Every structure is written in structure tokens, then in C-alpha cells.
Amino acid sequence: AILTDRYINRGTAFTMEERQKLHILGRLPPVVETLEEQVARVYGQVKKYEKPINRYQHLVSVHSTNTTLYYATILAHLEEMLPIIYTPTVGEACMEYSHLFFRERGVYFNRLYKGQFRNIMRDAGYQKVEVVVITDGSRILGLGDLGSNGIGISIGKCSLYVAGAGIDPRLIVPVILDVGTNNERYLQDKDYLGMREKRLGDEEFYELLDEFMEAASAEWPNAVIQFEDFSNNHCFDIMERYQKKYRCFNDDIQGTGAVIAAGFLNAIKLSGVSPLQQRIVVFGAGSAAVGVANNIAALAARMYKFPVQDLVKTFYLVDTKGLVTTTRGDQLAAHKKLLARTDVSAEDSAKLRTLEEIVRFVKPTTLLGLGGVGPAFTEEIVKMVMQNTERPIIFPLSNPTSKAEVTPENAYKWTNGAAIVASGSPFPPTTIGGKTFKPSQGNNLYVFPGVGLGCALAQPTHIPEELLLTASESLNLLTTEGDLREGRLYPPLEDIHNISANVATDVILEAQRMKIDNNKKLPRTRDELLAFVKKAMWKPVYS
């Protein structure tokens, strides 16, 4: 019963004396290993596979037999395992290898079960659930509708809360809300196991998602509900609908802006050009891109008490037409108005269409790549920014690497190593003249696990914007003098347990200051709280 329970199984780490006592001597090969030795063996077993999907499949096999060994392997090799266990491999697993997820916990909802959602949750037989990740498979980036196969996205994201913040793997629940699929291949595929129908309209979509939120608030009252990989037609509206009434957040929207804001303020500190002297080209004018700009302005206003209006005036927003201005003659989308230039004439607007002429005119010190249209930050454009600052801040954040505005290698080459670079994706180091440069990766893992652990301990009534901004600031402040002297914008990803403990600590203190915390057992002073949070974390060691 211990060997066959993946939560308590130790495999070859059972000592000979333990195997004798548990009557399992003949169930294992005779070698006895420590957990670090098992992790080294698993890491070799993974790297025997060349393709990410086969590495993923091997890690699923480990997780199904020895959960402690799985999470110990991820924690020892995190940067390398992240592309396998989540984006982009998990989406390819969902799309073409959905059987990899069948044996996992997954809770499936659809219109056939209307009015039974609470019964289904009760039936799942979990105890004090802490984190629930839900998707409908619609995709934040709107590529590759997964329908019911989106359950693998929720499974993968749940796993990152365990690895990142020590959420006990028994207290995470992955959910698929199957409201149909517009995936034409799936709609015709004899082997598609989900609802074989186009996506439900908004009225029915919200009827079912409302029942889900109300059922989860009753049956899983201790949980944070995290929306993952919902399409843009719904993801912003879901948060407007639920943010005050339920304990919920959207990582794609709120996590991303908190992580990019933290890293960007550290790039300002390194750059020699202080926040009010920055001239920031925001290349891309989607709701998400404007959210990131507003999250930067909010964080600088918190950290430095500059008037937020003056920080807004540092942004130069570029949409598909050109520089967004109040004078260029069009009716602006609501989200573009607050960053529109008021200081540019109609005549100058007409001559500010191409990114090259916009950069020549604006004289920016920062280029924020949120454009999703490929390598817009040319050598000529990067060379112009070198005219305005000694340390250009260049953030090519569009995903995947082919949609990205510039490679970190080109950014460093064209500035002779002056560029301060953050990426959505990991890159190898670049060496110029014997000096080494490596971009800072703004991975969402820096924030969501600590928000989850914080909301799990404090049990806040809801997750107001204050808790995300506090997580953003906490992350910024974790970047040490040492980190900064080596050009890093974030604390190191390998230190994610300490990072999450600190983010969670600061989130709790903010919930306590707002009197929204329902858990009154927690310390209310930072040093004693941080020690308490660290002790509360599940660790991937045998105990």
C-alpha cells in the first residue's frame, strides 16, 4: 500500500531495514539510493529522450509512481524542465497526445451536468483544497483551440504551484469547463472525447461558469480559483464579473503584468535613466499590452510616490496605425485613450506611422515589445536608442521566439553589451569581447505560486489589485545588490521556494492591512510570518 501510493512511495530510497520492515524486499531491485541520487538517475532517463514530448511522457511516468521524486527532479533542474512541463510542450501534449492526462486528477464540467456542479465537486473527495486551476481550452493567444483537451493545461499549471510554492500536491485541483470547441479537426475526430459542438454563446457560457464559481465557493471554500488560458473575448470580462465576489485571479493578465513591472523597474535602476526620465515605446496596443504599461506605472507610483499622471506621460503607445495620439483623427479604443499622446500635433501624427520614424521622433530610452508581429526592433532602431541612453532597455516579450521583436544576441551585439534585456523565453548567454551577457526571463512562475500560497494561508475574501501590486513589489525587492551588479532583473528562478515564501508573506501582510484575511492564526509581523510561511510549504523530500 506504500509502494502503490505515489504520494508516499520512495522507490529505491527505501533502505534495506525499511524494505525488511514493510515486507517489500522482493518488490524492488537491490540498489538503495538517496533522493539526490534518484533525481540524478531520473534526469539521465529524461535526457535519453531527444524530443520534448517524449521527455514529458517520461516525467508523467515518474509522477504517476513517485510524486516526491517527480517534484525533487523539477526543483533540481527547474530552468531546463520548465519548457517540458509547461509552455510550449504541455500544449503540444494536449493537442496531439491528450491520453498523457487520462490517469491524472482532472474534474470535467459541461452543460450536460448543469445543476450538478456542486455534487461533482463533493464526489471528487478532496479535503481542504487550496488551488483550483480552470480553463475552457479557448487559449489566451487564440491559437490551437484544445476544447476538453485543455484539461492538460490545468494539470500542468497546478503542478507549477506545487513546484514553485510548495502547495501540497493533494490540495490542487485541475478543472476543464468544456463549453465546446471551434477546433474543426476535433469536431470531426472520431476519437475526440469532449462536447462535440461549437463553443456556447456568452449567455450559456456565463450560466455554467457562474454555477462553477458558486459551487467551488461552497465545496472548496479554502481555494483560490485561477483562470488559465481563456481567450480575450472572455478573460477580461471574467475578472470584471468575479474579482470582488470570489477568491480568484487570472495569471495571463495579472501575473504577467506583475512580473514584467518588477523586472522593468530593476532595468530602470540599472540603466542610469530614472523613471521620470524614461521615454518608453510600447510596441503593441492590445488590452494586455496597455495592462502591462499601467502595471509599470502603478508599481513606480507605489515604490517612489511619483504622481501616476507623470509616469503615464513616459509611455508612447504604438498600435497597427502608428503612434497613438489625441490628434491623429481616429476614434480610439477605450484602453488606448489613457496612454494617447496629448503633446503631438495632427501634422506630426500623420508622419508617425512606421516604427523607425516613431523611434527617431520620440527618442526613446526603452523599447517594450508586446507587438506579436515578428522582429520589429531592427539594428537601425536599436542604434537610435543608443543615441538617447547609455543603457537601452529592450524587452522583446512577444511569444513564441519567432514573433519576438529582437533576439537578445542581436540586442547585445548591436549595443556592444549596453542593452538591458528581458525575454518571455529562456536564451543562452551571449559573449562579446570576452564579457558575458544573459537576458533576464520574466517567467510567470515568479508570481502566481506565491499569490496562491499567500491566498491559501490568509484565506482572503477576494484578491484585489493591491495583492497583485504587493506581489510585484515583493518580487522587485528580492533582486539583491549582488543580483543587480551581475545585470539580473529578478532573483534566480532556482530559488523559487524562497521567492514564493517572500511573495506570499508580503501578500498576506497586505490582506491583513486591508482586513480581508479570514485566517487569524497567522503572525502579523514580517520576520515571524516569513518563517511561518516557509514551515507551511510542502517540500519534495521524503518524510
Residue positions forming the annotated binding site:
139, 228-229, 252, 399, 443
Give 43 or 236: the residue with its C-beta nearer to ligand SWV. Answer: 43
For ligand SWV, the binding residues in 417-456 under the rule CB under 6 A are none
Q: Is 61 in the site for ligand SWV (CB under 6 A)?
A: yes
Return the half-sphere exposure (C-beta side, CA atoms, 13 A cut-off) of residue 12: 15
Stretch that binds its own copies, among 61-69, 203-211, 256-264, 533-541 (CB under 8 A): 61-69
Quote the distance between the C-alpha of residue 126 and its chain's center: 25
Cα gap 382→376, rounded to integer Å = 10
Q: Is 3 in the site for ligand SWV (CB under 6 A)?
A: yes
**In degrees rounded to 5, what are phi and psi of residue 455?**
-70, -35
Stretch that binds its own copies, among 25-33, 137-145, 377-385, 445-453 (CB under 8 A): 25-33
Which amino acid would we find at residue 486? E
Query: Which of its own copies, ligand SWV, none has residue 191 at its interface (CB below 5 to 8 Å by kind)?
Result: its own copies
Give 122 or 360: the residue with its C-beta nearer to its own copies. Answer: 122
Active site residue 86: yes
Q: Is 287 in the site for ligand SWV (CB under 6 A)?
A: no
Cα gap 519→535, rounded to integer Å = 16
Do the Cβ atoms of 130 and 167 come closer than 8 Å? yes
Query: Is the Cα torsion angle 249, 251, 257, 261 positive or negative in sign?
Result: positive
Give 73 or 502: the residue with its C-beta nearer to ligand SWV. Answer: 73
Cα gap 57→69, rounded to integer Å = 15
Give 36 or 390: the residue with its C-beta nearer to its own copies. Answer: 36
**Burial of 433 (C-beta count, 10 Å sphere; 0-12/13-18/19+):** exposed
Closest separation between CB of residue 389 and its own copies, Å? 51
Cα gap 389→369, rounded to integer Å = 18
Pick out the residues of the known binding site for (S)-malate: 139, 399, 443
Of 57, 65, 182, 461, which lies in the binding site for ligand SWV, with binding defined by CB under 6 A? 65
Closest separation between CB of residue 150 and its own copies, Å? 11
Of 37, 96, 102, 528, which lies in the binding site for ligand SWV, with binding defined by CB under 6 A? 102
Per DSSP bridges, beta strands 248-250 and 393-396 are unpaired
CA torsion 290→496→404→94, rounded to 10°? -100
Q: Is 513 in the site for its own copies (CB under 8 A)?
A: no
Among the listed residues 56, 70, 126, 157, the single catalytic one is 157
Give 6 or 351: the residue with its C-beta nearer to its own copies. Answer: 6
Beta bridge partners of 393: 366, 420
Among the listed residues 56, 70, 71, 86, the single catalytic one is 86
Query: Which of ligand SWV, its own copies, none has residue 148 at its interface (CB below 5 to 8 Å by kind)?
Result: its own copies
Of 117, 102, 111, the residue nearest 149 (C-alpha): 102
451, containing H or E segment: helix 448-458
Helix runs in 134-245, H state only: 151-165, 184-188, 202-219, 232-242
Cα gap 263→270, rounded to integer Å = 11
**Contact string (CB under 8 A) for its own copies, positions 116-155, x = contact:** x--xxx-xx-----------------------x--x----
Q: Is 107 in the site for its own copies (CB under 8 A)?
A: yes
Active site residue 157: yes
Closest separation between CB of residue 1 and ligand SWV, Å? 10
Q: Which residues contact 515 (CB under 8 A, 6 or more apart)?
A: none
What is the residue-wise DSSP string for 291-333? HHHHHHHHHHHHHH---HHHHHTTEEEEETTEE-BTTSSS---
Closest separation between CB of residue 193 and its own copies, Å? 4
Stretch that binds its own copies, among 109-117, 126-134, 313-321, 390-398 (CB under 8 A): 109-117
Of 8, 22, 28, 312, which lies in the binding site for ligand SWV, with binding defined by CB under 6 A? 28
Q: Which residues sit at the interface with its own copies, rule CB under 8 A?
A: 11-12, 16, 23-31, 40-41, 44-45, 48, 54, 57-58, 61, 64-65, 96-97, 99-100, 102-103, 106-110, 112-113, 116, 119-121, 123-124, 148, 151, 178, 190-196
The residues annotated as belonging to the active site are: 86, 157
* Footprint on this chain of ligand SWV (rule: CB under 6 A): 3-4, 9, 11-12, 27-29, 38, 42, 45, 61-62, 65-66, 69, 99, 102-103
